[PDB]
Amino acid sequence: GKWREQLGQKFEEIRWLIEEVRHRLKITENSFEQITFMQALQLLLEVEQEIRTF
């Protein structure tokens, strides 16, 4: 139904803007910064799965 589908589109767009700002950075694999981006991306995928599964 329409509400879920519109949320899921907003989640995809949030994730996409986050990937783009991460893509412009040149940072190391154990930077607090890298660790923080991974953790946000993961939390964001998990939340989008949960909306799908409600």
Side-chain angles (χ1 to χ4, degrees):
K2 229 24 165 72
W3 189 71
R4 270 193 187 178
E5 185 55 41
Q6 266 194 62
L7 268 180
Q9 292 146 22
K10 289 190 177 128
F11 284 115
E12 230 17 78
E13 176 65 13
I14 298 174
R15 187 176 76 256
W16 167 243
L17 303 161
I18 287 159
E19 294 282 25
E20 287 197 281
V21 323
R22 158 68 182 93
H23 166 71
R24 293 211 191 180
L25 304 174
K26 277 311 166 156
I27 43 156
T28 72
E29 205 54 1
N30 240 313
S31 62
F32 166 92
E33 200 115 44
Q34 172 66 23
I35 291 170
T36 299
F37 268 103
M38 281 191 278
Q39 187 182 329
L41 287 165
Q42 305 177 280
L43 196 48
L44 212 35
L45 289 157
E46 172 193 333
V47 160
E48 189 161 7
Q49 306 277 35
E50 264 181 59
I51 284 166
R52 207 182 82 234
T53 264
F54 189 54

